[PDB]
Every structure is written in C-alpha cells, then in structure tokens.
Amino acid sequence: GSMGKLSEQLKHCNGILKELLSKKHAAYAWPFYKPVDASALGLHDYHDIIKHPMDLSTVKRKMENRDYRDAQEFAADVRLMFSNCYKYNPPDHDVVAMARKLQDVFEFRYAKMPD
Numbered sequence: 001g002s003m004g005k006l007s008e009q010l011k012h013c014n015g016i017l018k019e020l021l022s023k024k025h026a027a028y029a030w031p032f033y034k035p036v037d038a039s040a041l042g043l044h045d046y047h048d049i050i051k052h053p054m055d056l057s058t059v060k061r062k063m064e065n066r067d068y069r070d071a072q073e074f075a076a077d078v079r080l081m082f083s084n085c086y087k088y089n090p091p092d093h094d095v096v097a098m099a100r101k102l103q104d105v106f107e108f109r110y111a112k113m114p115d
C-alpha cells in the first residue's frame with residue numbers, strides 16, 4: 001500500500017524539492033543531486049570536516065519514506081546540504097556560487113509556505 005498523503009505544508013516542500021531537481025535549475029543544482037563522492041572527487045578530508053552529509057536524492061528518499069514529520073525538519077536537511085558546501089569549500093569556489101543560487105531559489109519559495 002501507499003504512504004498516506006503529505007500534510008499541506010509537506011506538499012509545498014515536495015513542490016520545492018521537485019523544482020530544485022528540475023531541468024530549470026540544472027546548471028547550478030547538479031552538484032547537490034547525489035551524495036558527495038569524496039573518494040571520486042579526491043576530497044580525502046571531506047568526511048573529517050563534514051560530519052552530516054546531505055544531498056537532494058537523500059531529501060527525496062526521506063520525503064517518499066515520510067521521514068520528515070513537518071516542513072521544519074525538511075528545511076533543516078536542505079539548509080544542512082548548503083551549510084556543508086559553505087563549510088567545506090572556500091567562499092570563491094564555483095560550487096559555492098552554485099549553492100548560493102540554488103539556496104536563493106529554495107529560501108524564496110520556502111517563504112511562500114501556506115498557513
């Protein structure tokens with residue numbers, strides 16, 4: 001059987017998540033699609049610096065599995081993903097410019113939460 005329907009606030013969160021994964025934002029969202037493969041990227045200090053990795057595929061799996069009990073829990077994972085990028089990478093890195101752009105998409109639409 002299916003999972004019960006997302007709450008109204010979590011429907012809005014799922015909408016945002018679909019947008020962040022959509023071809024619309026692919027030019028700057030792609031680094032966030034899958035877990036950072038630290039070994040593949042040569043980032044052999046990544047897991048010493050980032051204790052709680054997060055990425056959009058993990059957020060999608062957690063939404064599908066009803067792991068998130070409210071919008072706040074969802075938003076915390078999306079912000080963790082951005083914070084990890086801002087912690088690990090120097091502020092003038094191309095990936096940080098991409099994070100700032102995708103976070104602007106996220107924060108402005110998250111602000112339109114129904115209540």
Ligand SMILES: CNC(=O)c1cccn(Cc2ccccc2)c1=O
Nearest residue numbers: 031032036041084085088089094095
């Ligand atoms: C969330 N991703 C990262 O923190 C990350 C750190 C270092 C390198 N890369 C690859 C990359 C992306 C974009 C431009 C250049 C290189 C990452 O994705």
